[PDB]
Design a protein around this ligand. Sequence first.
Ligand code: SF4
Ligand code: SF4
Ligand code: SF4
Ligand code: SF4
Ligand code: SF4
Ligand code: SF4
Ligand code: FES
Ligand code: FES
Ligand code: FES
Ligand SMILES: [Zn+2]
Lengths: 98, 150, 98, 584, 98
Amino acid sequence: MSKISININGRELVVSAGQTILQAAAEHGIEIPHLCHDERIQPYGACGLCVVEVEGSPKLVRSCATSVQNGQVIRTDTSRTVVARKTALQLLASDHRG
Amino acid sequence: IDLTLLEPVFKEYAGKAGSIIGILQKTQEIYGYLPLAALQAIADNTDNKRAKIYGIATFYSQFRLNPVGKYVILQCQGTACHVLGSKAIGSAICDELGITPGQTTADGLFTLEDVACLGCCSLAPVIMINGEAYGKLTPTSVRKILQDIA
Amino acid sequence: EKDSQVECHKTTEFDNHPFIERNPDKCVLCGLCVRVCDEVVGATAIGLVGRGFDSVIMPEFKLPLSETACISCGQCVDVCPTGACMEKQVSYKQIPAN
Amino acid sequence: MKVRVGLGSCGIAAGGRKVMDRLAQEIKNHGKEIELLPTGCIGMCFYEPIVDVFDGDKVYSYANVTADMATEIFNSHIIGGQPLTQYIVSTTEKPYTILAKQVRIALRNCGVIDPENVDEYKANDGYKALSKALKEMTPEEVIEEIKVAGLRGRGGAGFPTWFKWNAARQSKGEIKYVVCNADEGDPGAFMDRSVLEGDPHALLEGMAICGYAIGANEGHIYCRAEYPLAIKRLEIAIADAKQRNLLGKNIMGTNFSFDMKIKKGAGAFVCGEETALIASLEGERGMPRLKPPFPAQSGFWGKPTNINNVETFANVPWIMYNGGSAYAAYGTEKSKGTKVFALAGKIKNGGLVEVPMGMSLREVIYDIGGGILNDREFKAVQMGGPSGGCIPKQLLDTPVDYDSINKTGAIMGSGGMIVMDETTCMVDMARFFLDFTVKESCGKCIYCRIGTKRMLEILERITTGEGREGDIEELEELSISIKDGSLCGLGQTAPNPVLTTIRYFRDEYEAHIRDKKCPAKSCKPLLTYTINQDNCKGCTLCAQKCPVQAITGEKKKPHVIDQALCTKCGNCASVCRLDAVCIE
Amino acid sequence: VFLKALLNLGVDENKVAEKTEGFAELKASLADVKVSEEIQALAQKYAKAAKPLIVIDEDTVSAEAVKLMAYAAVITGKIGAAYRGIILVRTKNNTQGA
Ligand code: SF4
Ligand code: SF4
Ligand code: SF4
Ligand code: SF4
Ligand code: SF4
Ligand code: SF4
Ligand code: FES
Ligand code: FES
Ligand code: FES
Ligand SMILES: [Zn+2]
């Protein structure tokens, strides 16, 4: 009732309250990187690859540990998130042997 | 070793939640360090999920896992005492004792450890020996004081 | 590509468990394995040790996984995103395959 | 006749018991009714052991006293009536010099009151603010007075304390907690220990007032286990206050009840953050969690919790007794009141200082600090601890307040201010601060766990003479990414020394990269020892003192130092009587 | 007059100077325009609205009115993002296709 509808990456999506933005994007086929996320346990917030840009919040919000509201605008491929994920993956690759 | 004292202690603490820290502090106060047998005997009889007590014991910046000498040396490596030349004092201690930080002497009378800050930055550089502080230290002074202790 | 100035800690591990294979070099410290083994299985056969670079996930009291309370359920294997935790081979000679 | 002895964690470092018992022994040897009282450090730890003798209405301080000096004092002044003027630096008519420009609010009772006895605190208008708040005034009025005084958090963030108090009050819950963050892990910062060992009763009164304002009944002090005198005096304080109905059930005949407990921390720097402190208090591994929920909504054991450092709780009774307008009269329009600073480093007069905000930093270093030690030149000043920044000489007139020092790239921190002369290199100091951050990282997120070590490797390469071209660019990009990616404030403020020492001392990095020379002559790899052929005459005195024998030359002829063999130990310049060994 | 009333309510001139061509000439053209009460009320209602939409019927509105509405949306910064803009309904089914 009173459909919780969000706008992510320019598109309009209908979702369910109490979820995470990562779950909603997976439901509607939008790819957001994640490493320390599992829907059956509590969020951890370690990797940082799940950061998205939400209008109204000056800092990056993790889509694995935030709840969907009504009428929020989300961007997942801005330059700031891209360079953050690039830095995190460069730091991860600096210790991985195989 | 003395599991019986570990015993009055664990009896006393079995109740409050979050008592792992206090249990480890009293165990260190009794033994001077944490042997594996004491950690096992604490991980049992009050559970706390044996991996968890070990993980807590390792982190926490203070839980010494090895025996030490009679006198415990705490060189100040804070910013104020490092500015005034803590490195020279540390090199003097390392040369005169033949041990590095984190090690104990062969006869087990001195042990060298690093501390965040003494807090007596007015007397910098500072060292602690068994709760007695020496400040405004030159390498000759620390050499003389360790010969006097020895 | 790797430069020689930075260090990647090379391990000489030996965990001859008949079902579970661990490799600390490929770990990304996402913490999914320890979180699952504690909050779901409840055995807590593994845990974190150390700080900073020295942080490493290893069994209880650094003992082999066979000597601890492990159940060999394989949930830590099934939630790992990299090759650090692997299940052993059912076939005659297992392979990387689709 | 009454005498105070200025024992503390600094008095033990120079004198300590060596004085007091000797004085006590002298009293026992003479039988005169002399009140010998234990008091904390006043703030002039450059003269300790501090001794104060009160001849009538006159106060005499002729400190820097040993056991022989103490016996001389007893035989000359307390019996003969003759002060020893060759040791006096402060009297009643000639007193607070360094203390003349200080407005002491949280440090009002430090060095004055016996911390182990509540009667002296009561005699100094103590627990009157608690009585006023309990008997005359409502908790909403308490939060209003805190807001009117403009109280900001005396930690690194400078958050308005009234906002936290109000948020904790409006939080739903039958049980609430008040936790005092006494765990400050900043090197060079010792305001907490001084306050605890000088006036724990002010901290207890402020915590009780906060508990009445929010409605909490249980208090906690998370003090480090490495401060034994502080925890002993806190135990004495809670015993004395419980025996005087000041804490516990039915405080001063009012229906409000409040109790507190002492928790001994393990000494983790990450526990300075609020959520990590909560995790440590619950007996788990101290690791920051994700906000929201904030501790004011769900903190200790899931209950609402208000967390503030010791200095605000010490300031609260003074503003409650004097009024919020009186505290608002000090400071600036955006930072009202007073702040404590731990002043140390390359300075003449070190110790604990207290200044109103808005004062220029030049006044702090020169007017009260006495200038630079050994009359050298002022070069920099580190503020905010190893997560802070290094303010250069060109910004020496910046007023000390949160926004002004935030504009310079530094932070307030707990109040650790270290003075740096021209003889200390900024590259090595950035390496030192980054090493301290690396050692104290909890290793949860990728950025603080990996990037701090990478930047430490880069700084080590620069300081060992292996710095390559482009290392500054790598440093600044790593610093920006680490600041943007960390979870808690430990990793966010971690690259502050690295960035700031760039922005004001980039040339030194260039001198460390393209020249392999350290201008401050501190990096032993970057040192080069040469012998002036003009100003020394062939004595072979340095070469004999070199077991490396990197010096070659004939007698009565100038000597040449082999740079490929020299291990740069410094013994070949200390024994030089003609001072011809040049360090370049 | 509506445009002038919207301008007098404190629009950001720097952003509309950066993103548009000819803003200064338009501002100079509306320099001597007086504002009525009803226009002021409508301009206030549009200004305090966080996410205002404009629905223009193409059957009964001239093109220059549509241009002026687009100008009003552009100078206030309420265009080019979600839940904010101009909705234009066409006369026929596939007028947009034509
Ligand atoms: S196999 Fe199961 S019980 Fe064993 S470590 Fe993995 S998750 Fe824990
Ligand atoms: S799940 Fe795999 S990658 Fe993640 S922490 Fe455990 S072993 Fe490492
Ligand atoms: S496939 Fe994945 S786990 Fe295996 S070596 Fe490559 S990065 Fe590591
Ligand atoms: S920034 Fe550093 S201290 Fe903070 S959570 Fe991450 S690793 Fe731990
Ligand atoms: S500084 Fe030390 S190693 Fe170098 S030449 Fe002199 S004595 Fe030898
Ligand atoms: S000690 Fe001084 S004067 Fe003597 S040889 Fe060495 S540099 Fe020359
Ligand atoms: S998936 Fe790791 S921070 Fe959210
Ligand atoms: S930091 Fe070294 S004595 Fe305080
Ligand atoms: S004990 Fe030295 S200043 Fe306080
Ligand atoms: Zn150098």
